[PDB]
Amino acid sequence: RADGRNPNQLRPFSCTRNPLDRAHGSARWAQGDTIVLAAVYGPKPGTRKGENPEKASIEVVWKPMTGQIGKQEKEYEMTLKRTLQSICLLTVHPNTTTSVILQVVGNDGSLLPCAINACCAALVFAGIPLKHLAVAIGCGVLEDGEVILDTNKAEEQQLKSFAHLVFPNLITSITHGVMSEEDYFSCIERGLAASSRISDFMRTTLQ
């Protein structure tokens, strides 16, 4: 690949443990130049009037690195909320609201998978009960089916197929552009065997 990685290679990731003093848990998560800040606010008593108070609430606001949220970063906001509500164990702290704020710092590709991983780390740090870890990976599909892991901004302007996969340690998957069923399986096959690198990071280094 242009940047010198091979197809199954994840760009180097990193994380500063809770930069924010006011947050119960936070994570500035970086993969290459794509960097994100995730802030979580412990479980807070009470439930939005339009929610169920019988189960715990998870809420999310996606904030652009500048200006205000466009049609793309607001579907990301949506996917992220689906994914987080999914992995969180909701039966532990009923009548409670956990608010996640995601602030984009840089965007060199795989922004939604990055924001996902960032948020999984911050939840863990805030002591929010999870069913399992969420490990997300942006997969790109090359001309004749060659699968690429953790695409950047440049590869995202080149390829015609790709998938956002998130594995439990699937959870959710969203594909963009042409995707044969063979392409799709290569992506899940490839992503899965790579994902253990991200969760080994969450399970050891980040604790």
Curated annotation (Swiss-Prot):
GO terms for biological process: nuclear mRNA surveillance; poly(A)-dependent snoRNA 3'-end processing; rRNA catabolic process; rRNA processing; U4 snRNA 3'-end processing. One of its GO terms (molecular function) is identical protein binding. The lineage of its organism: Eukaryota, Viridiplantae, Streptophyta, Embryophyta, Tracheophyta. Belongs to the RNase PH family. This is Exosome complex exonuclease RRP46 homolog. Probable component of the exosome 3'->5' exoribonuclease complex, a complex that degrades inherently unstable mRNAs containing AU-rich elements (AREs) within their 3'-untranslated regions. May form a homodimer separately from exosome complexes and function in DNA cleavage process. Binds double-stranded DNA (dsDNA) and single-stranded RNA (ssRNA), and possesses hydrolytic DNase and phosphorolytic RNase activities in vitro. One of its GO terms (cellular component) is nucleolus. Homodimer or monomer when reduced or oxidized, respectively. Component of the exosome core complex. Transmembrane segments: none annotated. Keywords: DNA-binding, Exonuclease, Exosome, Hydrolase, Nuclease, Nucleus, RNA-binding, rRNA processing. Its EC number is 3.1.13.-.
